Amino acid sequence: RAGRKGVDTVGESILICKNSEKSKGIALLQGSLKPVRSCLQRGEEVTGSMIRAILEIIVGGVASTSQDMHTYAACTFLAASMGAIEACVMWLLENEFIQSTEEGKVYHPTHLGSATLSSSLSPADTLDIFADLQRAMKGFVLENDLHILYLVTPMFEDWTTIDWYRFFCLWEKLPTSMKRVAELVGVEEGFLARCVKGKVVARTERQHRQMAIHKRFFTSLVLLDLISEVPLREINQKYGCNRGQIQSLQQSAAVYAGMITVFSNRLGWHNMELLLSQFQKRLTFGIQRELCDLVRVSLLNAQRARVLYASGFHTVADLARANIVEVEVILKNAVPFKSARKEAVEERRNMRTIWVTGRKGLTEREAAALIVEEARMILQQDL
């Protein structure tokens, strides 16, 4: 990124080092990129990338027989550099992903197969997800939205560094209704104590998904406050994570929530599907059910939707009838100031202070007129 084309004569790069790390710095300047691996490499005859690859072609209906499988193996990048394929096919058979009809040896997708493909889910993750859902449908808590959120809470990657001492403090202060959900999932208070007392991550044993469970329940709490319209600064102080890690999490959970919804629909689990089908939109914007209609407008996010709701505008229909200058004023009240704000400067009438995507700078007035204009266009398309 050193050197602007058409602007600079040269691009300069400086790597600051010490005498001790002097040799490692030179290694980088002379270093070159490593050769590209296939990521489908084989004491592991089976592998995730291959299992998914084989599942996609069989369920999709472009690979039926055993001859089609090895023909596919020829097209891979792994074979370009110049058994394992057969192992993945059996794996799909053992775990009810694929069917075999002896037309000798022809493979067809199951309901679980077609569901996994439509859900864009990884076959390795689908097994635990399928069990987790069946476990939840045997005993489910409906008095709050926490248990539902847990099912759509992603835990395939760490989104933040969790302070366990902070976690235990929230555990005790946690209401009884949410402790019931914790117990029902696997959250044991004993494991939480062995985390604060001693910084033993363990996780060496495969059976230590016990760690992931507590990380997942911690995350669901964050997502619970998030769709409860709890301020980002409160969530930051309460949990110990920045706004960057949160936004990356909600956009991840919004997508994941859609996956579990599709997965539940293709298996015929209507009751479970019915509950989940409202959280994709709520996780995206971080809102409650009431603001779901307002946030259809492009410029209206969580903060702008709430202040317009609390001012009499509950729906797009109510927002189309709106007086523009009234919308503008309500927007002006949602701004965050360090001092308890909420002189006359008439030189700020042209200040473009509202950002969009692929944006021209919008004034607070122009944005308001756009919100009312868009609301009317949507109101007509609703008929």
Smallest gap from residue 137 Cβ to its own copies (A): 12
Interacting span for K ion (CB under 5 A) from 162-170, 290-298, 320-328, 364-372: 290-298
* Region binding its own copies by CB under 8 A among candidate stretches 49-57, 102-110, 197-205, 320-328: 197-205
The secondary structure of 23-49 as a DSSP string is HHHHHHHH--PPPPP-S-----SS-HH
* 8-state DSSP, 65: B
Which among 159-167, 192-200, 247-255, 257-265 is the span making contact with its own copies, rule CB under 8 A? 192-200
CB 13 within 8 A of CB 2: yes
User: Is 156 near its own copies (CB under 8 A)?
Assistant: no
Among 198, 337, 340, 380, binds its own copies (CB under 8 A): 198
Whole-Å CA distances, 207 to 55, 152, 190, 210, 212? 26, 22, 17, 7, 10
- Among residues 126, 107, 108, the alpha carbon closest in space to that of 116 is found at 126
Query: Pattern of binders to K ion over 294-333, x per CB under 5 A?
Result: -x--------------------------------------
Burial of residue 44 (CB within 10 Å: 0-12, 13-18, 19+) is: exposed
Structure token digits, residue 97? 């992903």
Q: In this structure, which long-range contacts are made by residues 81-88, counting pairs with CB atoms below 8 Å and at least 24 apart in sequence?
A: 81/38, 83/45, 84/42, 84/45, 84/46, 84/47, 84/50, 85/50, 85/54, 87/45, 87/46, 88/46, 88/47, 88/50, 88/51, 88/54
Comparison of 133 and 255: residue with beta carbon closer to its own copies: 133
Q: Where are the beta strands (DSSP E) in the chain?
A: 98-101, 106-109
Burial state string for 288-318 with b = 16 or more CB within 10 A and e = fewer than 16:
beebebbbbbebbbbbbbbebbeeebeebeb
Q: How far is the CB of 135 from its own copies (least distance, A)?
A: 9
Q: Least separation, in Å, of the C-beta of 134 and its own copies?
A: 7
Residue 298 three-state SS: coil
Least CB distance to its own copies at residue 131 (A): 9
Q: What are 215's two structure tokens?
A: 């990380």
Region binding K ion by CB under 5 A among candidate stretches 71-79, 203-211, 291-299, 317-325 = 291-299
Q: Which is nearer to K ion, 266 or 296 (CB)?
A: 296
Q: Which of residues 202-231 bind its own copies (CB under 8 A)?
A: 202, 205-207, 209
User: What are φ and ψ of residue 339, in 5° steps?
Assistant: -90, 160
Nearer to K ion, 215 or 281 (CB): 281
Site string for its own copies, 117-146 (x = CB under 8 A): -----------------x------------
94 binds, among K ion, its own copies, none (CB under 5 to 8 A by kind): its own copies
Minimum distance from residue 200 beta carbon to its own copies (Å): 5
- Least distance from C-beta 159 to K ion, angstroms? 23
- CA–centroid distance for 84 within its chain: 32
Give the residue from 296, 117, 338 showing the smallest Cα distance to 108: 117
Among 42, 111, 194, 233, binds its own copies (CB under 8 A): 194
Q: How far is the CB of 243 from K ion (least distance, A)?
A: 18
Site track 58-97 with its own copies (rule: CB under 8 A), x = hit: ------------------------------------x-x-
Q: Among its own copies, K ion, none, what binds residue 169 when CB lies within 5 to 8 Å by partner kind?
A: none
Q: Which is nearer to K ion, 246 or 295 (CB)?
A: 295
User: Which residues of the shown chain bind its own copies in the complex (CB under 8 A)?
Assistant: 94, 96, 134, 190, 194, 198, 200, 202, 205-207, 209
User: Which residues of the shown chain bind K ion in the complex (CB under 5 A)?
Assistant: 295
